[PDB]
Design a protein around this ligand. Structure first.
Ligand SMILES: *[C@@H]1O[C@H](CO)[C@@H](O[C@@H]2O[C@H](CO)[C@@H](O[C@@H]3O[C@H](CO[C@H]4O[C@H](CO[C@H]5O[C@H](CO)[C@@H](O)[C@H](O)[C@@H]5O)[C@@H](O)[C@H](O[C@H]5O[C@H](CO)[C@@H](O)[C@H](O)[C@@H]5O)[C@@H]4O)[C@@H](O)[C@H](O[C@H]4O[C@H](CO)[C@@H](O)[C@H](O)[C@@H]4O[C@H]4O[C@H](CO)[C@@H](O)[C@H](O)[C@@H]4O[C@H]4O[C@H](CO)[C@@H](O)[C@H](O)[C@@H]4O)[C@@H]3O)[C@H](O)[C@H]2NC(C)=O)[C@H](O)[C@H]1NC(C)=O
Ligand SMILES: *[C@@H]1O[C@H](CO)[C@@H](O[C@@H]2O[C@H](CO)[C@@H](O[C@@H]3O[C@H](CO[C@H]4O[C@H](CO)[C@@H](O)[C@H](O)[C@@H]4O)[C@@H](O)[C@H](O[C@H]4O[C@H](CO)[C@@H](O)[C@H](O)[C@@H]4O[C@H]4O[C@H](CO)[C@@H](O)[C@H](O)[C@@H]4O)[C@@H]3O)[C@H](O)[C@H]2NC(C)=O)[C@H](O)[C@H]1NC(C)=O
Ligand SMILES: *[C@@H]1O[C@H](CO)[C@@H](O[C@@H]2O[C@H](CO)[C@@H](O[C@@H]3O[C@H](CO[C@H]4O[C@H](CO)[C@@H](O)[C@H](O)[C@@H]4O)[C@@H](O)[C@H](O[C@H]4O[C@H](CO)[C@@H](O)[C@H](O)[C@@H]4O)[C@@H]3O)[C@H](O)[C@H]2NC(C)=O)[C@H](O)[C@H]1NC(C)=O
Ligand SMILES: *[C@@H]1O[C@H](CO)[C@@H](O[C@@H]2O[C@H](CO)[C@@H](O[C@@H]3O[C@H](CO)[C@@H](O)[C@H](O[C@H]4O[C@H](CO)[C@@H](O)[C@H](O)[C@@H]4O)[C@@H]3O)[C@H](O)[C@H]2NC(C)=O)[C@H](O)[C@H]1NC(C)=O
Ligand SMILES: *[C@@H]1O[C@H](CO)[C@@H](O[C@@H]2O[C@H](CO)[C@@H](O[C@@H]3O[C@H](CO)[C@@H](O)[C@H](O)[C@@H]3O)[C@H](O)[C@H]2NC(C)=O)[C@H](O)[C@H]1NC(C)=O
Ligand SMILES: *[C@@H]1O[C@H](CO)[C@@H](O[C@@H]2O[C@H](CO)[C@@H](O)[C@H](O)[C@H]2NC(C)=O)[C@H](O)[C@H]1NC(C)=O
Ligand SMILES: *[C@@H]1O[C@H](CO)[C@@H](O[C@@H]2O[C@H](CO)[C@@H](O)[C@H](O)[C@H]2NC(C)=O)[C@H](O)[C@H]1NC(C)=O
Ligand SMILES: *[C@@H]1O[C@H](CO)[C@@H](O[C@@H]2O[C@H](CO)[C@@H](O)[C@H](O)[C@H]2NC(C)=O)[C@H](O)[C@H]1NC(C)=O
Ligand SMILES: *[C@@H]1O[C@H](CO)[C@@H](O[C@@H]2O[C@H](CO)[C@@H](O)[C@H](O)[C@H]2NC(C)=O)[C@H](O)[C@H]1NC(C)=O
Ligand SMILES: *[C@@H]1O[C@H](CO)[C@@H](O[C@@H]2O[C@H](CO)[C@@H](O)[C@H](O)[C@H]2NC(C)=O)[C@H](O)[C@H]1NC(C)=O
Ligand SMILES: *[C@@H]1O[C@H](CO)[C@@H](O[C@@H]2O[C@H](CO)[C@@H](O)[C@H](O)[C@H]2NC(C)=O)[C@H](O)[C@H]1NC(C)=O
Ligand SMILES: *[C@@H]1O[C@H](CO)[C@@H](O[C@@H]2O[C@H](CO)[C@@H](O)[C@H](O)[C@H]2NC(C)=O)[C@H](O)[C@H]1NC(C)=O
Ligand SMILES: *[C@@H]1O[C@H](CO)[C@@H](O[C@@H]2O[C@H](CO)[C@@H](O)[C@H](O)[C@H]2NC(C)=O)[C@H](O)[C@H]1NC(C)=O
Ligand SMILES: *[C@@H]1O[C@H](CO)[C@@H](O[C@@H]2O[C@H](CO)[C@@H](O)[C@H](O)[C@H]2NC(C)=O)[C@H](O)[C@H]1NC(C)=O
Ligand code: NAG
Ligand code: NAG
Ligand code: NAG
Ligand code: NAG
Lengths: 208, 317, 226, 39
């Protein structure tokens, strides 16, 4: 589930089944690629280090779902959010609720920083070749890579990762193209075209 | 035939399912199509018979009729009057054990407001005694004769039903309609009754000081709970907000008095199908309809109905 | 300060016995509750179970008859065992401290309460992949490079994951960008690590990337030069 | 209530009893009287 809210406002996240008795929901924050961190440890009680007004719905209402209000929403709070429901009528939940991803709107926007590396000499001596274009600092994470052999398209051999944010607005993507030592020297030059948001950045490399 | 299960709750194994989520058929307005409807009953109301299949406890003793929800069971003050040519004489003595001459008698036409409170072990909202607490008995030596105690100061008691019940309005016939207990809104909690242990302290001390006037002065007086039998006798059977409570009085009468700030809470059970007073013939049984919301009631303990054991020449106590 | 570290093999064959250890630093294991939490890829973290001194320990009813936890007081660490593994156990296992609490809703005496636990101080976590394939050592190849410049290293052929890459034995933490691996059709991952450096580095300002792959105990120090 | 199938209009409001055919509904003259001491 996804929640879109502008920065400097109030966000609201729903998690878990409907309440049946007196509950003590525990909230967790999962930063992308990190370990979950504690935010609320007793259904609207923050420990030391968590700012206000991070609030949850009181655990005395019967018949509602756990809602998490986040006032003054920032881009740094953009992360997944899980919940541990502690309902007096239900057995112990050994599985956290399905997390809710927060989307903070009006992110800067970023032209992709592409970098094309040719194959190393020690790899050519090993009868291998791999072109690598590494793409970073692009937003949002939605890019499509296309390889070219000096105006000839490359169909197969392309292995590409899926966009992946990295503790920032920076997404990451690595595109590898596997070739043989003769294929590199054959064509005049090779190009990696990254199509990002209507625009297309190309970077080329030529043999020596 | 009721196909019953436990109520939706995860608690330890030391909690017998007082409440049972039951399902059964019912006749609708028409005498053709049935009705797979569910209700919630207390364990005391039902009994298994050989998936757990039960029945109502009274199906094998007597018929049953529901108490209309329009009527109430609120004890109101009743003044009893006599007709012309008659009069009601009222003893005006402060210390009077009910039997014998009364020095200061007056007369009246109608007694004071006597609330008909139905309880068994503890008298409630009664008339306080004057000055010293009062003991009354037909034959103190006979251990088979009850000993009625009337209090001078009232002991505050608080009984509550912490369950926000729901009323299901089933249509059993073209005119009749049954009020089942729907789902519980909130926590699975038990009915209980509170007694301030300080006031109860002093009250028990003041009754034992009056007992020593009849059983010798330097003797030891012990209090134990009921012996056993029916629930109506072994528990402080009564009605409060409409539900009929049955409380365990083992924490009040477990003491021992020699010659010389919290509340005592009591586990109170509730029953809806009661058959007191034989049932008006050998047939009728009453179903106390389910009551919406949490019931809380504050009453006075104004007297006791005690009984002594037949030790004969057993002890000084 | 409280530092938690999870450490294990990383690759376990099906129907075997996983064994993990959580190195704890800054506090004793006798004075804290310790819980283990795995999380499959793209799933919600699954609570495994908790352990403490004096024999107070509990597991997951779904994983009841397979797990065994322990505490080493002498060596000050936590221990986990999971017998008879299958493909469902592949996940990222975290070691965290646990704090207890009671919420009372009724009157206490009626046992009208329940204890709720919450983990506050997590560990960095360890990865565990269940596969019947063998471990493959990585193959390190340096990626050769006015104003600024780029320069990188490449790990092309390894299994199962992960491979920790430092620069100059950890003396370069500014401008480093490590990119996520890609699973190739042969079943071998491949990642790359770049550093943005000033063009003025004739030096030679030695750049030596240190790769370590624990499942194959492969440690390769690759010197890159234009 | 949902071949047209019906019910009686009152099955869903109240029970029902038939008026015996022996009794009649004929309005007869009633003279109202008061007791002694009244007029
Ligand atoms: C017959 O006699 C018996 C004899 O016992 C009676 O039985 C009693 O009956 C009552 C109810 O009738 C029960 O009340 C419950 O009490 C518990 C416990 O409360 C006490 O303990 C709390 C915690 O103490 C522990 O933690 C603290 C640290 O927090 C620690 O320092 C301490 O050492 C200990 O380890 C105290 O916080 C609490 O203080 C509160 O009350 C004081 C009253 O004197 C007041 O002075 C304080 O300022 C403070 O306000 C007290 O000492 C309660 O937890 C419980 O209330 C919660 O749960 C119920 C049921 O779910 C719910 O309806 C309430 O709304 C309340 O839930 C709020 O509080 C939770 C805890 O903070 C929180 O998690 C919830 O989310 C919710 O709070 C949220 O919203 C509020 C909205 O303002 C906000 O403030 C919060 O920050 C949060 O956002 C019950 O009231 C008794 O337990 C029971 N037995 C005993 C032994 O007491 C019986 O009643 C008698 N018969 C009859 C008919 O009455
Ligand atoms: C020993 O002595 C004590 C002290 O008197 C006595 O306590 C009494 O307890 C009863 C039971 O709880 C109390 O009676 C109820 O009071 C509540 C609310 O209190 C008052 O609220 C308003 C003003 O706030 C008053 O106008 C009102 O009259 C109450 O006094 C009421 O909600 C109850 O009324 C309902 O039930 C009555 C009969 O049961 C109906 O006549 C009345 O119309 C109400 O019906 C409603 O109830 C349904 C929900 O329950 C609702 O769904 C229906 O639609 C309907 O609208 C009731 O009056 C009483 O106040 C306490 N004493 C005094 C002096 O007030 C002990 O009971 C006594 N010992 C024993 C064994 O009884
Ligand atoms: C005492 O025992 C009785 C036995 O009948 C219980 O009554 C049933 O309880 C269940 C749940 O416990 C109820 O089922 C719920 O129904 C909801 C309504 O959806 C249906 O109704 C609409 C029309 O209103 C239809 O169009 C629709 O297609 C559905 O058929 C559902 O939304 C609920 O879904 C939730 O729970 C299920 C549980 O499996 C999940 O799978 C869902 O994802 C979701 O979380 C649920 O299915 C049922 O309605 C109750 N009966 C009646 C007549 O209402 C009592 O609950 C029980 N009481 C206690 C206290 O234990
Ligand atoms: C759902 O119901 C289950 C019961 O099936 C319930 O789990 C139970 O939780 C209690 C926690 O209070 C467990 O009791 C523990 O037992 C161990 C020994 O086995 C004790 O050492 C523990 O001691 C604690 O409590 C003492 C007094 O309360 C303290 O003095 C001490 O310092 C410890 O804090 C503890 O009592 C019990 O074993 C489980 N039951 C099972 C079967 O595991 C669960 O809480 C319920 N959950 C919900 C949401 O309703
Ligand atoms: C529980 O018991 C107390 C007893 O103190 C009840 O309050 C008291 O009620 C009595 C009457 O039942 C009051 O006595 C009367 O007072 C008038 C005052 O003019 C007096 O003229 C009468 O002769 C009679 O003695 C008494 O004043 C009152 N106490 C206080 C402090 O107000 C209480 O109502 C009882 N609760 C119940 C039965 O639910
Ligand atoms: C009353 O309820 C019971 C179940 O609680 C129903 O029992 C069914 O009886 C028929 C008899 O022919 C069996 O074939 C079914 O297997 C029983 N179970 C069902 C249908 O779930 C019974 O039908 C109900 N009475 C009605 C609906 O009139
Ligand atoms: C009516 O039902 C009650 C309860 O179901 C019966 O009382 C029980 O009877 C059984 C067998 O006769 C005994 O084992 C139990 O000990 C009895 N219970 C108690 C509390 O004494 C009663 O016998 C039934 N009456 C009939 C069938 O005529
Ligand atoms: C009420 O108290 C009086 C006085 O204690 C009791 O009177 C006793 O009556 C018996 C026989 O009826 C005599 O043998 C005693 O001598 C009387 N006592 C005194 C002191 O003279 C009376 O029995 C008591 N009644 C009740 C019901 O307790
Ligand atoms: C017990 O449950 C009933 C269920 O109807 C509650 O009544 C509802 O309460 C909510 C919030 O308290 C109101 O918004 C609804 O309007 C109420 N229903 C009706 C029909 O009016 C009741 O409040 C619960 N008990 C308590 C003490 O809150
Ligand atoms: C019984 O109930 C009454 C009223 O519910 C209690 O009296 C009040 O209790 C509240 C909360 O406990 C106090 O804040 C008030 O000051 C009390 N007022 C008076 C006049 O007492 C009473 O204490 C309860 N007693 C017991 C034994 O449960
Ligand atoms: C009065 O107190 C006695 C002693 O605490 C209770 O006796 C116990 O009753 C339970 C329930 O039947 C038995 O399991 C125990 O074995 C009994 N103990 C002894 C020593 O006999 C008795 O139940 C209490 N009275 C009531 C009515 O609850
Ligand atoms: C009334 O109170 C007595 C005393 O607490 C209860 O007897 C207890 O019964 C349980 C079994 O459910 C035992 O575990 C306790 O040890 C008993 N108490 C004592 C002091 O021995 C009794 O069960 C309660 N209820 C009834 C109906 O007697
Ligand atoms: C009368 O009540 C007291 C109060 O609970 C009982 O005292 C308990 O005795 C047992 C002995 O088996 C102890 O383990 C408990 O700790 C005592 N409780 C308290 C609160 O002190 C006493 O047992 C009861 N009377 C009898 C004869 O059992
Ligand atoms: C009892 O039956 C009557 C008539 O069948 C119902 O009155 C009709 O109700 C329906 C639906 O509620 C409305 O669409 C009609 O407009 C009503 N008729 C008139 C003349 O107003 C009545 O609601 C039923 N009562 C129940 C089912 O409780
Ligand atoms: C009800 O609960 C008790 C204890 O929790 C259990 O032993 C029993 O089997 C349960 N019965 C049903 C029908 O669920
Ligand atoms: C009262 O108890 C005594 C005790 O011995 C007994 O003899 C007598 O028959 C009982 N009945 C009375 C006094 O009416
Ligand atoms: C209160 O009652 C208990 C029960 O026996 C007794 O031990 C205590 O002495 C009493 N309190 C006072 C002040 O007499
Ligand atoms: C008991 O002794 C007291 C004095 O301590 C005395 O007032 C009382 O009358 C005596 N009661 C008897 C002997 O029954």
């Amino acid at each position: 589930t996804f929640v879109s809210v502008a920065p400097g406002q109030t966000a609201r996240i729903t998690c878990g089944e409907e309440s049946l008795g007196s509950r003590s929901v525990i909230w967790y924050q999962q930063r992308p690629g990190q370990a979950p961190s504690l935010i609320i440890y007793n259904n609207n009680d923050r420990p030391s280090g968590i700012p206000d007004r991070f609030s949850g719905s009181p655990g005395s209402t019967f018949g509602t779902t756990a809602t998490l209000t986040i006032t003054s929403v920032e881009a740094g709070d953009e992360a997944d959010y899980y919940c541990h429901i502690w309902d007096s009528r239900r057995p112990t939940n050994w599985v956290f609720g399905e997390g809710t991803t927060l989307i903070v709107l009006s992110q800067p926007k970023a032209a992709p920083s592409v970098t094309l590396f040719p194959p190393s000499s020690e790899e050519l001596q090993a009868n291998k070749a791999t072109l690598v274009c590494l793409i970073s600092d692009f937003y949002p994470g939605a890019v499509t890579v296309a390889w070219k052999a000096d105006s000839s398209p490359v169909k197969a051999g392309v292995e590409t990762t899926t966009p992946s944010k990295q503790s920032n607005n920076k997404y990451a993507a690595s595109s590898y193209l596997s070739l043989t030592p003769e294929q590199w020297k054959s064509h005049k030059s090779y190009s990696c075209q990254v199509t990002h948001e209507g625009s297309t950045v190309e970077k080329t490399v030529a043999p020596t | 035939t009721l196909q019953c299960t436990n109520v939706t709750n995860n608690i330890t194994d030391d909690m017998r399912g007082e409440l049972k989520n039951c399902s059964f058929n019912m006749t609708t307005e028409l005498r053709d199509k049935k009705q797979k409807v569910y209700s919630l009953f207390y364990r005391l109301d039902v009994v298994q018979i050989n998936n757990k299949e039960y029945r109502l406890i009274n199906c094998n003793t007597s018929a049953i009729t529901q108490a209309c929800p329009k009527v109430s069971f609120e004890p109101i003050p009743i003044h009893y009057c006599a007709p012309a040519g008659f009069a009601i004489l009222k003893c005006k003595d402060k210390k009077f054990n009910g039997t014998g001459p009364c020095p200061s008698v007056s007369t009246v036409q109608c007694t004071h407001g006597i609330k008909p409170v139905v309880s068994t072990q503890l008298l409630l909202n009664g008339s306080l005694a004057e000055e010293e607490v009062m003991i009354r008995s037909e034959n103190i030596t006979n251990n088979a004769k009850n000993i009625l105690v009337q209090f001078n100061t009232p002991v505050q008691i608080n009984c509550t039903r912490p369950n926000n019940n729901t009323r299901k309005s089933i249509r059993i016939g073209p005119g009749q309609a049954f009020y089942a207990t729907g789902d519980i809104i909130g926590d699975i909690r038990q009915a209980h009754c509170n007694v301030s242990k300080a006031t109860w302290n002093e009250t028990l001390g003041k009754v034992v000081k009056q007992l020593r006037k009849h059983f010798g002065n330097n003797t030891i007086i012990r209090f134990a709970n009921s012996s056993g039998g029916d629930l109506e006798v072994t528990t402080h059977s009564f009605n409060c907000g409409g539900e009929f409570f049955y409380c365990n009085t083992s924490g009040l009468f477990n003491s021992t008095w020699i010659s010389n700030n919290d509340s005592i809470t009591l586990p109170c059970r509730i029953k809806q199908i009661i058959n007191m007073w034989q049932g008006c013939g050998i047939g009728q049984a009453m179903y106390a309809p389910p009551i919406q919301g949490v019931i809380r009631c504050v009453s006075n303990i104004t007297g006791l109905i005690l009984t002594r054991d037949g030790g004969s020449t057993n002890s000084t106590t | 300060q409280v530092h938690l570290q999870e450490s294990g093999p990383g690759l376990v064959k099906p129907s075997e016995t996983l064994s993990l250890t959580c190195n704890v630093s800054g506090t004793l294991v006798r004075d804290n509750y310790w819980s283990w939490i795995r999380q499959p890829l793209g799933k919600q973290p699954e609570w495994i179970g908790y352990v403490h001194d004096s024999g107070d320990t509990n597991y997951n009813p779904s994983l009841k008859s397979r797990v065994h936890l322990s505490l080493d007081k002498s060596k000050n660490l936590v221990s986990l065992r999971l017998t008879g593994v299958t493909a469902a156990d592949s996940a990222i296992y975290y070691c965290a401290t646990t704090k207890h609490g009671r919420r009372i809703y009724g009157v206490v005496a009626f046992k009208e309460w329940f204890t709720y636990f919450y983990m506050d101080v997590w560990g960095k976590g360890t990865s565990v992949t269940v596969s019947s394939a063998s471990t493959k050592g990585p193959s390190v190849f340096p990626l050769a490079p006015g104003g600024t410049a780029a320069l990188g290293c490449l790990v092309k052929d390894y299994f199962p994951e992960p491979v920790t890459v430092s620069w100059n034995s950890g003396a370069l933490t500014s401008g480093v960008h490590t990119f996520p691996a890609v699973l190739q059709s042969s079943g071998l991952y491949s990642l790359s690590s770049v550093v943005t450096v000033p063009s003025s580095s004739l030096g030679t300002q030695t750049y030596i990337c240190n790769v370590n792959h624990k499942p194959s105990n492969t440690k390769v120090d690759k010197r890159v030069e234009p």
